[PDB]
């Protein structure tokens, strides 16, 4: 303790200790004491902090905080427990024992990029923004422990040398040298450890290259914090694990001089707000939000407004779009005490002439909570690898990443059939099976899928009869609403398409006069709205809906069979149990939107007219 | 006519697994018509509370009768687990059932269990003293008698805040 | 139970202040009021210095318990106050707020002061959680007020009791009813 | 409490002590209103026995809402009118209890509420 | 639904919090078709030798009883909270500015509205002065201040300001010849959080 | 003997053995006077709290030697009670068991706490592994001096301390003789395995995590990997952790709950009596027909006999044959959901993929520095279904490599198999299903019976019957199926004269309003049944004895099988079904034998009847008739 500067004491002595007692505004909210105590009450053991309060307090710490944060951010912990344990006393009688805590940091300074995380930027606090891939399980770590040889809780600065002398020396002259250390984990501790991960951005030198990435670290409360495939804002720190320059040159033919490895640990991850950047699992949403939600649900002019949410630069296809979003909400996983988990999620088909904006539309359906896109030639056999550490046979197993999300693809036609069958199947039972190596783990996950396609011979097949698909009718089976795409001519239509997109395509046009349309706004809102509305309501039918829908499917199959007989040959699609079993999910999607649980058949006449497109499509 | 409440009639409804000792007649609201003015000594039955609220705990038209949650085994180990017996919503109200049902046991245990359970709330809401943040916290291990005071204590803090300065 | 209902109780209390008038466009009220002369103290309630200081009419001074050493020793006595402690005016948690809004234009040391009042408030409250942590067997004939203040107790009031009736009905029925060998409800 | 408040009043019809007369006009006016409102519900078949102000219809009978009491008397246990064990009474203290048992001291004004 | 609908019946008031468009007389018609749908059965066995007095009916008495219990006391709430809300806003104003509509009067609430207003009127007469000063209690909290000017508002509807003006247009910019007794009714039923 | 509260704690456990509770029940006739000698006693903490909560929850926070002391005090007690069993001079650890509920986390949630605790797990039996012995102490001897010393050794996985490190002695005094006597030098049993979350609570946006387990002597390998399990034990963490490199965990101190048996049932000879009382009822077969598939027309009359494995038939040092049954047929839309009526209804039910390499039945046994010297080993995916049946989907989509690899043990009903490292063989005499598709969808009857399927005609004799499954409707039946399917849609959703609500009671309730979602019984009690006679549990409680009973042949079988097989091979290859008369062979006899063998177990009639003849032929003709 060399009390001149950089001292162990001055900070903790009063400064950090009193910063919070001193942190004041009237309204008598403006401390971190209340938040701390009320956090403690519910087992949290943390609190949230800024980094530009020091400017609110002083002008010295921060330019010293950046320099040796590893120490300051534990002096913070000690000050925290001593300033909070006084309040742990209601009187001296109900600190049954103290406890350890974790601090947070945050700011709005600016995000950096991985291409610059360099030797200067090391041991130093920072901010970035990347994206997540996958990260480990939850192993272990602790802080100290005792040993029978000395019986002292072994205290450490770093988060190993174990010296010579015995300490069971009280044996006479017959002592026990040469490191006799019996670790006593009756006396040890336990914190968490998870190894988060990080990929770089999609616009920041991937151009003539590929994107690199980084692996991470945590201690106590940031496990169970991040599920992968997410956009983060971060404050962490860039540091190493090993050390050395001189001619103790590494390995066998490694390390010309001194190369040690990278990583970062987190001091105060947060998340993103790309509209709703991070709204996927947790709830920091507030009562105003939910009022907004239900009062828009109360609004009986929400669905047709939502027919105009994906096409603010696109014209037409409105009867086409009355259920392009109903796909998103999902209906009901109405499972039963026997096996019959009748199919939850929902699936759609579309195929027709190019030049009609299928690609951009599916890009947008990815845009608007969780989803992915490849298409053909290749998300997901599922993956049984063999761990290069220890050589065990683990399962990465990537429809797992639609375990509640959805999927979109075109290019079902343009990829061969060695890889269609596991996915032919998954989307009738949702259980990814496995039987390959010594494991029988019938995995599962609730994904949907969107299916675009391309018919060879175009509208020729569509004019006359049966050249609809090139591959099979068993995946003509699994889908409910199935859509031709033509580009039939009309000069009015032509000119209107003409100016419609040019007025789009001119000067990055519609910034000001775009959103002035009615209520067709904020796909961000839709992320949140969806992740809400699916997460509560579990509706199912009303009695009056069932008989008319039943009779309607009856007449559907009778008309298909009559067209079979009105041509003296099969002129139908197979009248399946799946068709009713899916239109039920269309009713369910509708009731999911308006939040009314019990749905009536007028609510679903809309469904009738929408799958009527498929009926009258495969009518010929 | 009740210990009144907006929950005025979550009162006389809880269905049971009531057995039979003797004959019965004309079950009425069951599958019954002009079909059975006679039935067996011994048949488990689901039954409301209202007509049986006043049917002679001494007399045996019906019998020793408990629900299975209300059977004593879990309830016994929950006077030993009167510390973290967890509820949820499979039995959302679990607090004043005996506040009718106790004398119909013929084994004299119910009320002791229950009183111990809520002496635990004499110990429990030590932690409940504030409204820290956004909408909802822990809102499904709840009978809807604790719901009331829960909201209430929340409000108490909520307005204490506006006191805390001009706020 | 409110933020202001207790100021109909608390804010009626008095200090003595200094105005800058003598007796005003009116002299004096038929009342306990003192004669008005500037440059000298006068005793008033504290629902008016509010009205007056911000009307730019007066100065003001506090009581004496609004200090340091009293509010440095009351706390350490209060530490091992297994029950309660010194009580300077017994609702100083409301006087101090309506004090420290404006008067800190010229009050001294209005910050370490606030520090201590919070430091005492929280602890006494927290004590008033753990009193509950012994309450067994329906002890609704045994309790503590002995040097309580009121601004702490109304923060509990509606919660427990509207429950405690049907809570300890099982045992309050005991010294009020009868049955066979077992406990009654 | 328009239910059995009337019943204590027909027990004595106290002077300005218990209740006041305009309250009585108010209250019987109201109870007439409730009945002549129920008029337009079921009054071809208004209650065939429990017809007027009824027998099980009660509102405010309960007298054990356990309230806080303020000491003001002999700082020893000045043992006085209450059913419970008010042993250990005092002057600046409290040992909290129900209310039924003391509708006495506060009509004496020996004690007070908080 | 078997004695649950009141959750739906006061759901008439679902948006009517303080952003209220208007109100109606819901939830009586088919449901009080019950009360006469049932007395037939409830008194079907009335003084009959159909059983000559045995145990058998003993639920059925109670069936009637609980049916009625639910009915009547649901109804008690259905008017009672309506009295409560109207009383609150009528503590924000006298019967100067009556209800939003005066069309959600379920007929016997003639009796009830008028009864409550005038029971309180009687109590008023006792109150204030022995003769009775209906004494301003919850509005026009100007200390001794101006008498005759108009001010700015926040978009009221209801249009009930009869008081002393030709037309003051009781909304935002209700700005006309406004005296004091003109402007004597509304403080927080939705206007002048802002002059 | 550490801090002297240990002995206070010893006698606090001795204070268990006072009166009716333990002096009456728990001490005496409990392991040794009953003589099964399980040193692991049965404790339940709750009684200990009812004596000394300082010893109840002082245990579930610290277990340094409270267990050691418990076992010590117990052995000293029985040393007083019964010196006959005083020859087991060891710790004799105890249970501390229970279906209590203090803290019962997942393998996911042994999360940086619980260290130094005694808690619960649930999860999957997996990696049921190899055995070894362990060292206790060595009874040496010196013929030079006739001196038998001794030396016990420890390590952390057993208790806290570690041996004062050294190997077994030699010339330990000065040069005299050290003859290591074995047999007196003793050994326990050891074991090591892991568990996974029975996972379906797992968030498949996330990874279902793993655990680490150790066991010991009288606990050794008590179920098979492929089952469901709950367990309750204590926890420890030995390794270095940057003092040297990070940290790991382990679990022990435990007793088991396997939670899927029938012998778990408190079984008298009364359950058999209920079965045999109702056994005489003749048309119960049709009830079991409508039993397992109550949520779907359609078969299962026959599928039962797969579900019953089969019947054993061996000859005097001659041969043996495999007793079991196997069939399958259909365009999409109840085929692909008639397979999960087994995965989650009946035991020993392990579905396979349709896409599987090197462990559909293989192992491949690849190894990397096991704790022991296992150079080559793994296990497979068939013995999991030994003595029963199996599911698959996408069979026609299966490889035509391993199809023949099925035929191996399927047709043999034997294993003589290996992966070229060691010849291996056993008796796995299993059945199986899979799924199916015509290569083009809607075709199996117009063009041909065969060749709308397109594969080897060799298997069709390996299986039992050519069969049929189709989908069409005429003008009249459509509304009949409509009302059937709408019964499906309503007898599943709950809750189905001027005013009829506001009934004496309502939905307003305390604790029996809606359990999950209610169901009807109206007119399925016109079907005079009950939810217990037609159920899961009484059904499965009639599994075991039909598997124990063995209905031998009658005599009238022979002329009938003769006449019927005669006409079968006469004129089954005519009348529009000739190309579906390809696989006729001398194999319908043994399947008929399995048929009547099974059906004579469904009422357990150790006998044979002509009615069974009709029952076992009529399905075969109904294939097409
Ligand atoms: N009707 C339209 N209105 C506005 N823009 C359109 C329209 N049709 C096409 N476009 C534009 O033309 C481009 C079409 O490319 P896209 O990738 O959709 O082809 P496609 O329709 O998917 O054909 P294919 O399915 O064969 O790939 C998009 O960038 C889209 O913005
Ligand atoms: N009678 C029935 N019994 C059971 N399920 C039925 C019945 N009728 C219709 N269904 C339902 O209709 C859906 C039809 O899908 P199905 O499982 O038959 O496809 P699949 O048999 O797997 O097709 P494939 O045989 O080509 O794989 C299923 O979800 C099934 O539950
Ligand atoms: N001549 C025969 N002698 C003995 N068994 C025969 C004879 N012909 C048919 N069988 C039947 O055939 C079975 C063995 O036939 P197998 O060799 O499997 O036929 P495949 O050559 O088609 O596989 C026996 O179980 C027996 O029931």
Swiss-Prot record, chain A:
The keyword Phosphoprotein does not apply. Residues 302-502 form the MCM domain. It is found in: Nucleus; Cytoplasm, Cytosol. SMART domains: MCM (SM00350). It catalyses: ATP + H2O = ADP + phosphate + H(+). It is an enzyme of class 3 (hydrolase). GO terms for cellular component: CMG complex; cytosol; MCM complex; nucleus. The keyword ATP-binding applies. One of its GO terms (molecular function) is DNA replication origin binding. Belongs to the MCM family. PANTHER family: DNA REPLICATION LICENSING FACTOR MCM FAMILY MEMBER (PTHR11630), DNA REPLICATION LICENSING FACTOR MCM5 (PTHR11630:SF42). This is DNA replication licensing factor Mcm5. It comes from Drosophila melanogaster.
From Swiss-Prot, chain C:
The GINS complex plays an essential role in the initiation of DNA replication. Component of the GINS complex which is a heterotetramer of Sld5, Psf1, Psf2 and Psf3. It holds the Pfam family PSF2_N. Keywords: DNA replication, Nucleus. The lineage of its organism: Eukaryota, Metazoa, Ecdysozoa, Arthropoda, Hexapoda. This is Probable DNA replication complex GINS protein PSF2. It comes from the Eukaryota. One of its GO terms (biological process) is DNA strand elongation involved in DNA replication. It is found in: Nucleus. One of its GO terms (cellular component) is nucleus. Belongs to the GINS2/PSF2 family.
From Swiss-Prot, chain F:
It is found in: Nucleus; Chromosome. One of its GO terms (cellular component) is nucleus. Its EC number is 3.6.4.12. The keyword rRNA processing does not apply. GO terms for molecular function: ATP binding; ATP hydrolysis activity; helicase activity; single-stranded DNA binding. The modification Phosphoserine is found at residue 499. The modification Phosphotyrosine is found at residue 515. It is an enzyme of class 3 (hydrolase). It catalyses: ATP + H2O = ADP + phosphate + H(+). A motif (Arginine finger) lies at residues 461-464. One of its GO terms (biological process) is DNA strand elongation involved in DNA replication. Keywords: ATP-binding, Cell cycle, Chromosome, DNA replication, DNA-binding, Helicase, Hydrolase, Nucleotide-binding, Nucleus, Phosphoprotein. Residues 284-485 form the MCM domain. It comes from the Eukaryota. Belongs to the MCM family. Acts as a component of the Mcm2-7 complex (Mcm complex) (Mcm complex) which is the putative replicative helicase essential for 'once per cell cycle' DNA replication initiation and elongation in eukaryotic cells. Core component of CDC45-MCM-GINS (CMG) helicase, the molecular machine that unwinds template DNA during replication, and around which the replisome is built. This is DNA replication licensing factor Mcm3. It comes from Drosophila melanogaster. The lineage of its organism: Eukaryota, Metazoa, Ecdysozoa, Arthropoda, Hexapoda. The chain holds residues 4 to 648 of 819 of the full protein.
């Amino acid at each position: 303790n060399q009390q001149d500067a950089q001292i162990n004491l001055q900070a903790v002595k009063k400064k950090y200790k009193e910063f919070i007692r001193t942190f004041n505004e009237e309204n008598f909210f403006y401390k971190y004491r209340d938040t701390l105590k009320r956090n403690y009450l519910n087992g949290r053991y943390f609190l949230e902090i800024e980094m530009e309060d020091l400017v609110g307090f002083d002008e010295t710490l921060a330019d010293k905080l950046n320099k040796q944060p590893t120490e300051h951010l534990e002096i913070f912990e000690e000050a925290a427990r001593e300033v909070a344990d006084e309040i742990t006393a209601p009187r001296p009688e109900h600190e049954e024992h103290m406890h350890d805590i974790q601090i947070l940091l945050s700011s709005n300074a600016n995000p950096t990029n991985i291409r610059q995380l360099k030797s200067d930027c090391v041991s130093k606090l920072v901010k970035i923004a990347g994206i997540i891939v996958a990260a480990s399980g939850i192993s272990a770590k602790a802080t100290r422990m005792s040993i029978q040889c000395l019986s002292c809780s072994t205290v450490i600065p770093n988060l190993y040398a174990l010296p010579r002398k015995c300490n069971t020396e009280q044996a006479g002259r017959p002592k026990c040298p040469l490191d006799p250390f019996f670790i006593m984990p009756d006396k040890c501790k336990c914190v968490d450890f998870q190894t988060l991960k990080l990929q770089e951005l999609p616009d920041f030198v991937p151009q003539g290259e590929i994107p690199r990435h980084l692996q991470l670290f945590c201690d106590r409360s940031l496990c169970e914090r991040v599920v992968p495939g997410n956009r983060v804002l971060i404050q962490g720190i860039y540091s190493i694990r090993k050390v050395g320059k001189p001619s103790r040159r590494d390995g066998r033919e490694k390390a010309v001089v001194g190369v040690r490895a990278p990583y970062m640990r987190v001091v105060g991850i947060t998340v993103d707000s790309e509209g709703a950047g991070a709204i996927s699992r947790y709830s920091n949403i507030t009562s105003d939000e939910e009022e907004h939600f239900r009062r828009m649900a109360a609004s009986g002019d929400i669905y047709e407004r939502l027919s105009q949410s994906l096409a603010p630069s696109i014209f037409g296809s409105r009867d086409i779009k009355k259920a392009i979003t109903c796909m998103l909400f999902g209906g009901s996983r109405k499972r039963l005490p026997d096996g019959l988990c009748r199919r939850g999620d929902i699936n759609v088909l579309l195929l027709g002439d190019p030049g009609t904006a299928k690609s951009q539309l599916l890009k947008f359906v990815e845009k608007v909570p969780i989803a992915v896109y490849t298409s053909g030639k290749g998300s997901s056999t599922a993956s049984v690898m063999k761990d290069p550490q220890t050589r065990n046979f683990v399962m990465e197993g990537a429809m797992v990443l639609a375990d509640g999300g959805v999927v979109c693809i075109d290019e079902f036609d343009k990829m061969r059939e060695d890889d269609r069958v596991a996915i032919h199947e998954a989307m009738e039972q949702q259980t990814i099976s496995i039987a390959k190596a010594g494991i029988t783990t019938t995995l599962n996950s609730r994904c949907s899928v969107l299916a675009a396609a391309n018919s060879i011979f175009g509208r020729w097949d569509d004019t006359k009869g049966e050249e609809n698909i090139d591959f099979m009718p068993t995946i003509l089976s699994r889908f409910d609403m199935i859509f031709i795409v033509k580009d039939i001519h009309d000069e009015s239509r032509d000119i209107t398409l003409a100016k419609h997109i040019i007025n789009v395509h001119l000067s990055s046009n519609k910034s000001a006069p775009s959103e002035p349309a009615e209520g067709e706004i904020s796909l961000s809102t839709f992320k949140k709205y969806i992740h809400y509305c699916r997460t509560h309501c579990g509706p199912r039918l009303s009695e009056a809906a069932g008989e008319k829908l039943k009779s309607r499917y009856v007449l559907m199959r009778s008309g298909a069979g009559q067209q079979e007989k009105a041509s003296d040959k099969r002129l139908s699609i197979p009248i399946t149990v799946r068709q009713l079993e899916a239109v039920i999910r269309i009713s369910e999607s509708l009731a999911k939107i308006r939040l009314q649980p019990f749905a009536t058949d007028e609510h679903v006449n809309e469904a009738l007219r929408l799958f009527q497109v498929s009926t009258l499509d495969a009518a010929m | 006519p009740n210990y009144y409440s907006i929950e005025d009639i979550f009162v006389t409804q809880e269905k049971v697994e009531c057995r039979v000792n003797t004959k019965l007649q004309r079950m009425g609201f069951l599958d019954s018509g002009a079909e059975s003015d006679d039935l067996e000594p011994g048949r488990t039955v689901n039954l409301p509370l209202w007509y049986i609220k006043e049917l002679k705990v001494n007399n045996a038209y019906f019998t020793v009768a408990v629900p299975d949650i209300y059977r004593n085994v879990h309830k016994a180990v929950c006077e030993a687990e009167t510390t973290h017996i967890e509820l949820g919503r499979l039995h959302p109200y679990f607090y004043e059932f005996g506040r009718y049902l106790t004398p119909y046991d013929r084994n004299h245990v119910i009320g002791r269990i229950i009183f111990e359970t809520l002496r635990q709330r004499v110990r429990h809401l030590l932690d409940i003293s504030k409204s820290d943040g956004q909408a909802a916290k822990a809102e499904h291990r709840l009978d809807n008698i604790e719901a009331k005071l829960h909201e209430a204590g929340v409000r108490t803090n909520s307005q204490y805040i506006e006191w805390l300065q001009m706020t | 139970m409110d933020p202001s209902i207790i100021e109909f109780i608390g804010e009626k209390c008095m200090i003595s202040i200094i105005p800058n008038f003598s007796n005003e466009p009116l002299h004096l009220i038929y009342g306990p009021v003192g004669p008005f002369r500037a440059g000298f103290p006068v005793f008033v309630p504290l629902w008016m210095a509010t009205h007056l200081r911000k009307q730019q009419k007066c100065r003001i001074v506090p009581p004496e318990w609004m200090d340091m050493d009293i509010l440095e020793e009351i706390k350490e006595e209060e530490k091992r106050s297994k029950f309660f402690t010194k009580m300077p005016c017994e609702h100083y948690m409301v006087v101090a707020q309506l004090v420290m809004s404006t008067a800190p234009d010229d009050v001294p040391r209005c910050e370490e002061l606030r520090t201590v009042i919070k430091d005492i408030f929280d602890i006494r409250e927290s004590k008033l959680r753990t009193s509950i942590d012994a309450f067994i067997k329906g002890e609704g004939t045994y309790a503590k007020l002995d040097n309580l203040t009121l601004l702490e107790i109304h923060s509990v009031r509606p919660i427990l009791p509207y429950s405690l009736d049907h809570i300890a009905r099982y045992q309050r029925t005991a010294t009020a009813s009868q049955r066979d060998t077992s406990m009654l409800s | 409490f328009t239910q059995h408040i009337l019943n204590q009043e027909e027990s004595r019809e106290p002077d300005d002590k218990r209740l006041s007369p305009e309250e009585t006009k108010f209250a019987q006016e109201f109870a007439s209103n409730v009945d002549e409102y129920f008029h337009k519900v079921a009054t071809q078949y208004m209650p065939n026995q429990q017809r007027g102000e009824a027998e099980q219809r009660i509102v405010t009978p309960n007298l054990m809402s356990h309230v806080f009491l303020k000491a003001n008397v002999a700082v020893p246990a000045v043992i006085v009118g209450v059913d419970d064990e008010e042993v250990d009474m005092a002057a600046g203290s409290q040992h909290i209890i129900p209310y039924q048992l003391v509708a006495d001291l506060i009509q004496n004004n020996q004690a007070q509420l908080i | 639904m078997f004695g649950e609908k009141a959750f739906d019946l006061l759901k008439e008031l679902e948006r009517s919090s303080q952003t209220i468009p208007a109100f109606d007389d819901d939830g009586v018609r088919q449901v009080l078709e019950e009360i006469k749908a049932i007395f037939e059965e409830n008194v079907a066995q009335a003084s009959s030798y159909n059983a000559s007095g045995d145990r058998s009916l003993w639920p059925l008495l109670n069936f009637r009883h609980a049916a009625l219990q639910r009915n009547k006391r649901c109804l008690l709430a259905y008017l009672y909270e309506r009295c409560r809300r109207i009383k609150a806003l009528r503590w924000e104003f006298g019967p100067i500015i009556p209800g939003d509509i005066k069309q959600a009067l379920c007929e016997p609430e003639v009796t009830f509205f008028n009864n409550y207003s005038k029971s309180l009127a009687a109590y008023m007469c006792s109150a204030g002065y022995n003769q009775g000063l209906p004494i301003d209690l919850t509005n026009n909290l100007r200390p001794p201040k101006s008498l005759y000017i108009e001010v700015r508002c926040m978009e009221d509807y209801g249009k009930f300001e009869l008081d002393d003006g030709e037309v003051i247009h009781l909304k935002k910019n209700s700005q006309h010849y406004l005296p004091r007794a003109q402007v004597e009714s509304l403080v927080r039923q939705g206007i002048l959080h802002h002059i | 003997e550490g801090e002297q509260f240990i002995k206070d704690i010893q006698r606090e456990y001795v204070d268990f053995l006072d009166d009716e509770e333990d002096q009456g029940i728990y001490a005496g006739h409990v392991k040794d006077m009953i003589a099964e000698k399980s040193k692991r006693l049965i404790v339940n903490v709750n009684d200990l709290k009812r004596k000394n909560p300082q010893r109840a929850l002082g245990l579930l926070s610290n277990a340094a030697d409270e267990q050691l002391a418990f076992g010590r005090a117990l052995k000293e007690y029985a040393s007083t009670v019964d010196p006959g069993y005083a020859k087991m001079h060891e710790d004799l650890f105890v249970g501390f068991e229970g279906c209590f509920g203090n803290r019962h986390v997942t393998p996911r949630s042994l999360t940086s706490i619980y260290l130094g605790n005694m808690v619960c797990v649930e999860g999957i039996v997996t990696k049921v592994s190899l055995i070894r012995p362990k060292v206790v102490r060595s009874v040496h001897y010196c013929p030079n001096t006739r001196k038998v010393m001794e030396r016990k050794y420890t390590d952390l996985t057993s208790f806290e301390a570690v041996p004062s490190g050294a190997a077994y002695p030699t010339k330990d005094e000065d040069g005299n003789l050290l003859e290591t006597e074995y047999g007196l030098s003793v050994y326990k049993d050891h074991q090591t395995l892991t568990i996974q979350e029975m996972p379906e609570k797992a968030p498949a946006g996330q990874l279902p995590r793993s655990v680490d387990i150790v066991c010991d002597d009288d606990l050794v390998d008590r179920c098979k990997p492929g089952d469901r399990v709950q367990i309750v034990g204590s926890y420890r963490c030995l390794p270095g952790k940057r003092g040297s490199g990070t940290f790991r965990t382990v679990l022990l101190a435990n007793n088991i709950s396997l939670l899927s048996k029938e012998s778990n049932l408190d079984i008298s000879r009364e359950d058999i009596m209920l079965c045999k009382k109702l056994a005489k009822n003749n048309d119960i077969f049709e009830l079991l027909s409508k039993s397992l598939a109550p949520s779907i027309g359609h078969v299962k009359q026959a599928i039962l006999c797969l579900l019953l494995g089969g019947v054993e038939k061996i000859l005097p040092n001659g041969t043996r044959l495999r007793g079991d049954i196997n069939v399958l047929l259909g365009d999409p839309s109840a085929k692909s959901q008639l397979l999960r009526y087994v995965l989650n209804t009946a035991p020993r039910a392990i579905p396979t993929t349709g896409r599987g390499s090197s462990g559909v039945g293989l192992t491949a046994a690849v190894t990397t520095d096991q704790e022991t010297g296992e150079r080559r080993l793994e296990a497979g995916a068939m013995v999991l279904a030994d003595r029963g049946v199996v599911c698959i989907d996408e069979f026609d989509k299966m490889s035509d490599i391993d199809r023949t690899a099925i035929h191996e043990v399927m047709e043999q009903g034997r294993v003589t198999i290996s992966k070229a490292g060691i010849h291996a063989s056993l008796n796995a005499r299993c059945s199986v299903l899979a799924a199916a598709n015509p290569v083009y969808g809607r075709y199996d009857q117009y063009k041909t019976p065969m060749e709308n399927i397109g594969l080897q005609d060799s298997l069709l004799s390996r299986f039992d019957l050519l069969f049929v499954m189709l989908d069409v409707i005429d003008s009249d039946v459509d509304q009949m199926i409509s009302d059937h399917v709408v019964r499906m849609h309503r007898y599943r959703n709950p809750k189905e004269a001027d005013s009829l609500s506001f009934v004496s009671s309502s939905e307003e309730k305390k604790d029996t309003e809606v359990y999950e979602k209610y169901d009807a019984l109206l007119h399925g009690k016109s079907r005079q049944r009950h939810e217990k006679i037609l159920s899961v549990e009484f059904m499965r409680k009639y599994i075991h004895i039909a598997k124990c009973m063995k209905p031998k042949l009658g005599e009238q079988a022979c002329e009938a099988i003769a006449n019927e097989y005669s006409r079968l091979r006469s004129q089954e290859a005519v009348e529009t079904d000739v190309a579906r008369t390809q696989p006729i062979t001398a194999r319908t006899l043994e399947t008929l034998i399995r048929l009547s063998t099974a059906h004579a177990r469904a009422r357990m009639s150790k006998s044979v009847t002509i009615d069974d003849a009709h029952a076992a032929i009529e399905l075969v003709q109904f294939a097409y008739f």
